[PDB]
Amino acid sequence: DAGALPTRYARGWHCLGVAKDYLEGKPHGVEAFGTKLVVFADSHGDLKVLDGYCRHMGGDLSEGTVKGDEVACPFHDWRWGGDGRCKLVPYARRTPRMARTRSWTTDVRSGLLFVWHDHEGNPPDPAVRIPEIPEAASDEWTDWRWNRILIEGSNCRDIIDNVTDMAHFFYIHFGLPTYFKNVFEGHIASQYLHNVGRPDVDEAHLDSEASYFGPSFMINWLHNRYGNYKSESILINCHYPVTQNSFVLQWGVIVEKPKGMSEEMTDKLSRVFTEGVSKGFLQDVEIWKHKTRIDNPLLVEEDGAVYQLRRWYEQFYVDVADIKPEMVERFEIEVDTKRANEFWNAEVEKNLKSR
Amino acid sequence: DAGALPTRYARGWHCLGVAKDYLEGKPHGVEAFGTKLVVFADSHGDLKVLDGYCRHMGGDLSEGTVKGDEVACPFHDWRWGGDGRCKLVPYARRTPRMARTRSWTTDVRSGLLFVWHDHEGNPPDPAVRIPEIPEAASDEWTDWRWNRILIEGSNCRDIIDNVTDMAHFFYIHFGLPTYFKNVFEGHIASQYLHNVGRPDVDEAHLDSEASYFGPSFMINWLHNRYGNYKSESILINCHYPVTQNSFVLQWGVIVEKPKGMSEEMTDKLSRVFTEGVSKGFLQDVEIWKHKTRIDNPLLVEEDGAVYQLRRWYEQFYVDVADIKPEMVERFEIEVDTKRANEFWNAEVEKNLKSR
Amino acid sequence: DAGALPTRYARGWHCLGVAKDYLEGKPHGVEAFGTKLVVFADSHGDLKVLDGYCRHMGGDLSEGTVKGDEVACPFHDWRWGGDGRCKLVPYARRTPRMARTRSWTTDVRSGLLFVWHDHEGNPPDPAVRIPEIPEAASDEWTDWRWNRILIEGSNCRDIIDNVTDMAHFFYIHFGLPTYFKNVFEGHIASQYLHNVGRPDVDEAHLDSEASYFGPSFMINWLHNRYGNYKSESILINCHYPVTQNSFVLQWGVIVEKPKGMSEEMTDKLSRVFTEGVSKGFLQDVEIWKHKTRIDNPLLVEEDGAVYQLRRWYEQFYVDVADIKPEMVERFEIEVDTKRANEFWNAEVEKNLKSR
Ligand SMILES: C[C@]12CCC(=O)C=C1CC[C@@H]1[C@@H]2CC[C@]2(C)C(=O)CC[C@@H]12
Ligand SMILES: C[C@]12CCC(=O)C=C1CC[C@@H]1[C@@H]2CC[C@]2(C)C(=O)CC[C@@H]12
Ligand SMILES: C[C@]12CCC(=O)C=C1CC[C@@H]1[C@@H]2CC[C@]2(C)C(=O)CC[C@@H]12
Numbered sequence A, B, C: 001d002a003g004a005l006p007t008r009y010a011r012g013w014h015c016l017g018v019a020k021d022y023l024e025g026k027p028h029g030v031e032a033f034g035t036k037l038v039v040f041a042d043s044h045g046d047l048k049v050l051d052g053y054c055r056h057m058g059g060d061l062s063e064g065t066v067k068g069d070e071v072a073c074p075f076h077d078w079r080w081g082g083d084g085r086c087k088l089v090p091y092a093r094r095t096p097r098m099a100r101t102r103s104w105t106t107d108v109r110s111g112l113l114f115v116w117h118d119h120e121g122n123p124p125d126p127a128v129r130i131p132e133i134p135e136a137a138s139d140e141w142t143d144w145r146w147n148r149i150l151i152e153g154s155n156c157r158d159i160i161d162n163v164t165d166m167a168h169f170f171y172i173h174f175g176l177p178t179y180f181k182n183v184f185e186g187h188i189a190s191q192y193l194h195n196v197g198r199p200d201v202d203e204a205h206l207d208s209e210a211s212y213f214g215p216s217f218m219i220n221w222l223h224n225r226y227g228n229y230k231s232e233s234i235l236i237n238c239h240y241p242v243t244q245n246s247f248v249l250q251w252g253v254i255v256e257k258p259k260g261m262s263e264e265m266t267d268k269l270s271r272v273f274t275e276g277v278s279k280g281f282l283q284d285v286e287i288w289k290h291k292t293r294i295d296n297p298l299l300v301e302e303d304g305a306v307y308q309l310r311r312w313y314e315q316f317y318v319d320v321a322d323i324k325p326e327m328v329e330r331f332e333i334e335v336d337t338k339r340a341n342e343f344w345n346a347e348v349e350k351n352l353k354s355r
């Protein structure tokens, strides 16, 4: 087909992007989780998210203004708090008693705004809180260079399978994976990789840890050496669903700044390092934009733990009380890359000799 | 959600626009009431409306030509009368006996073309005939300056609620409503308003009567004074449904011509008066294009008769024999604007003082 | 309505176009029969068609490359044969044993690529094989000048009715049909026509045989004389479904080259002959793009065998074992054009006299 669409959105923290982009004193609209949301900061700078359409007569709160700690609807100026409470009908004798719209719980981590989603309507388990990335604040590192695209005709689950995919590193990312291991446990699914650049594409040695913390947000630590020169990168791979067949895919890059040369040159290099990582990610995007998901895939041993990863991902789409132990218990596997590398080295060699 | 879509289009007269725009010797296509229609004038200039697709093999009658009193299909030239009768198959030995397509009953009032729609297929109650507006013919007034837009992702019921909306006059139209009363009876729902311009936006005094005559057509008489100079306007607010989630919204303006100065200057002023009224209407459009309808609204006393207006509007979506007395009996209410005006005057004052 | 959409695509040979356009050493994507297909030639130049999305993890085979006799998926380079077999996973210890994707049976006739479709999944009856057109190879004739358009909001059955349509030759093609006969038998439905140019449009005498061989592919032999000068044309009218409400309509023209004058002038004329035929076809396209299908048409005697043609066409949408004799037995009819021609000649005369 392949695969009945999910009937709920995933339970978890979803990143909506860089926090400071949701400030500038105004509210902002975001289409997400089958609805429209309004994001706004109160007078203390703390960020809030509500259902976007006013509970009075359907005005678009995202196109209103911020007055104090509330968002004012552009239609009749009703004031809504970050907790969803109707704080004031400015022209009325009586503001409604205990009126509320839906509030979405927020979090700011590493200069990124997150929103909690749960079909069951329960608040975040503190155990799944998205980790701080100290390097974001550190002035030894750049600040987020962020991107976003809308992908249509695809569900967001269609990109999670990359976690278990060893062989695509050769064909898509033009490198030779000499080490590959997955670990799934609780709310975290991880990929550990050693990757060597291909001689036949113009060598680099990459060590990569990448972990999804919950269903939608992956931090990828990139430790690359090109001879003796080490470089350090952190890449965010994240998304949020718009509908069950469209989603917003976002990536953000920071790099350790080279220490030290002219400020002007440090910038020039850091731009190259960043752009490089982004082109790496864009290689995956191109495949994601031009593929379908296969629910009943044809698999070889080298595919690794496709079924187990998907089983892990299922935990976010069932009620917490129905989470099965096989979704969350520690599972690990190392994929043997030896034979693939012998074959690939031959392909690489054949290509060099050929010119 | 909010609100299950209606399962039929409203029973009533719907305006398709300015009659003379449907002449120029040819037929015209209109998408309406979930189908396509053909509009055309016979040899006496009288305007007719049929289902647009030919009952023979599906040719588009709207792209045919007018021959005498019939529209000729562009495919095999069959002739269709304004009453839907198949008058002639030009090349055939025998024209079908008593063949008919669906005819739509028409009316021309005040230089505007109207069409009758009724799910039950009954002809117009003469009691709901759209009133003549003498000012249209009068050469003391301009001629219709008409506009139309297609609004998508909204049902046309989503704009009727403005009738009961006192408070939006301040936030959307930048005036202070010191008088506000609704009257609903039979097929007519009306709003009577006294409105004063806000000092803090750069004063005008407006008296307004606006009545929907049936479900889709509102005439608005605008009696404005700016000091000692009175001006008279008539504004048409009307629509027709295209689908249950798109509709065409149209507005038309005429003004009493200032009497009297140079013909050239009279035109110059009348253009300003007209453009002014249109910008008033466009303020509502902007809200209508950027909102949702709330089926179960959160209401304050100041909202007035939201539920009663909607109940009145329901009469057009039930079979005539099922019209309930509470939809059509006289209902009236005056909304007390005193407190709102004290509050608003304070807001206005605060803004002046602030600069 | 008119007409419930079909629930399967037609059983038959469908032309995807000119074979050589599907070569140039790469694979090609085609949206058809509700899915996406990949077309590619193996190392012997023989053309193949598979389901377009890889059975592994959903890569787009149409965007891969051809390696030897297989198409290589762009994601993990798996090799797929023209018969759908998984020939090789290049990096794996073991290629899957007896893995297959869906293969589509192909045929090349007259320099055109064809694909077999059958909901029942059975292979082509050799009896319905598309005939060779020797004139394609002959260097006394031009080579295919081919066109294609996507028609949206219409099912492909909506164009088959032209076969039975005598009267449209006057109104759409501006000629006078003095002879008209249909013959339906087995998998072939044909129209034989003698057509005379109208005096009142700026005379030509056309003899035309046009036959659908199966549900989607029509060959039209055009024998035209303009005085003493005969010209010979062959026109292909064909389509394939994309969805049940969109299809690709294609037409191809070849003409007997005038024998003989300068090579340069022979080309100049042949371009005119071709362009002429194409403008003839484009007259039908314009009606097809602007009409609906009528499931329960209003008919006159002159319509001929509308019901019988549709009954013939139904054979392709039922299981072979359920094909009813009345779909496939020989049916023929001649439509009497005499009276229509008297009437038309009068219309023509009236138009000449009028200027
Ligand atoms: C973020 C990412 C994609 C989605 C996924 O599931 C796992 C990873 C980790 C490896 C990343 C990759 C993005 C592209 C990267 C930067 C390369 O070009 C080399 C390493 C690789
Ligand atoms: C036509 C209308 C909208 C729809 C509706 O339901 C009722 C009215 C009557 C008041 C009109 C308004 C249009 C905008 C106007 C001209 C102003 O800017 C001041 C008065 C106001
Ligand atoms: C291919 C065709 C359309 C579809 C169909 O069903 C049958 C025919 C045969 C007659 C063709 C016509 C195409 C247009 C042609 C070339 C003319 O302008 C004169 C003859 C006519």
Ligand code: FES
Residues within 6 Å of the ligand: A054, A055, A056, A057, A058, A059, A073, A074, A075, A076, A077, A078
């Ligand atoms: S619609 Fe939000 S205040 Fe009225």
Ligand code: FES
Residues within 6 Å of the ligand: B054, B055, B056, B057, B058, B059, B073, B074, B075, B076, B077, B078
């Ligand atoms: S389709 Fe209207 S006349 Fe044949």
Ligand code: FES
Residues within 6 Å of the ligand: C054, C055, C056, C057, C058, C059, C073, C074, C075, C076, C077, C078
């Ligand atoms: S998706 Fe086709 S080879 Fe993996």
Ligand SMILES: [Fe+3]
Residues within 6 Å of the ligand: A162, A284
């Ligand atoms: Fe990747």
Ligand SMILES: [Fe+3]
Residues within 6 Å of the ligand: B162, B284
């Ligand atoms: Fe208004």
Ligand SMILES: [Fe+3]
Residues within 6 Å of the ligand: C162, C284
């Ligand atoms: Fe034709």
